[PDB]
Amino acid sequence: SMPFPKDCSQAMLNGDTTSGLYTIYLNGDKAQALEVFCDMTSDGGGWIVFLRRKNGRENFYQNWKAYAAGFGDRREEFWLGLDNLNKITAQGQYELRVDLRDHGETAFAVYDKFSVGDAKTRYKLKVEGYSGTAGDSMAYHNGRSFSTFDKNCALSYKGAFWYRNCHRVNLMGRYGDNNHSQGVNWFHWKGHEHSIQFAEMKLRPSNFRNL
């Protein structure tokens, strides 16, 4: 086992194959512990989950400081925090996976390269290298800074995202809201008038697949 694993791939390689809560250590530094939910089962496991939608119990219409820091219950609905995502994606080359489920149907999207910039970039999104079945709805958002109501698409739709004008992905939107563009949307799978019941975003090293 590795003593201060820096992501869920190094915690899974430590022999922990059950999904749940794990401690990771940013930059492998024992003074930078972060509790994360690891998905150890999807496509070989080793994923840090950073967004979960599943029941509408948590409020995702939150401000900049909340999106920077993280909020929620990591075993249920939560957002890991943009500062954490920047620090994790700075450790090496990471891939993004999105898992979606709605009324028994499932879809996914993977991006071979995924990073989140620092606060001076307003947590700029980078995604490249799509594969999947949900449709490449993140391409529209590539390169964009993050936006909240207090830093307007986030106000108009009462969510938060790397908005453009405004979105094809809205996974921090209003739970269960099928009004156009208001809900948990992945446009190229279910459009703008269907809020998705279950969604997770997660990341792991891109070289995991053959490490």
Are residues 87 and 25 located together in one domain of the fold? yes
Q: What is the DSSP string of 58-82?
A: S-----HHHHHH-EE-TTSSEE--H
Q: How many domains does the chain have?
A: 2
Which residue segment(s) compose the domain that 184 sits in? 135-197
Q: Residue 45's closest CA among 209, 178, 164, 158?
A: 209
CB 142 within 8 A of CB 112: no
Strands (E), 8-104: 20-25, 33-39, 47-53, 71-72, 78-79, 94-102
Are residues 43 and 32 located together in one domain of the fold? yes
Q: One-letter amino acid identity for 3? A: P
In whole angstroms, give the CA distance from residue 144 to residue 124. 5
How many other CB atoms are there within 10 angstroms of residue 55's CB atom?
A: 12
Which CATH number does the domain housing residue 172 bear?
4.10.530.10
Per the entry, the structure determination technique was X-ray
In whole angstroms, give the CA distance from residue 30 to residue 202. 23
Are residues 172 and 110 located together in one domain of the fold? no
CA distances from 1 to 15, 29, 32, 123 (A): 7, 16, 19, 32
Instruction: Copy the structure tokens of residue 162.
Output: 């790397």
The three-state DSSP-derived secondary structure of 157-209 is: HCCCECCCCCCCEECCCCCCCCCCCCCCEEHHHHECCCCCCEEEEEEEEHHHH
In whole angstroms, give the CA distance from residue 149 to residue 151. 6
What's the distance, Cα to Cα, between the start and end of the chain in Å?
15
Residue 44, classed as helix, strand or coil, is: helix
Residue with tokens 């108009």: 156
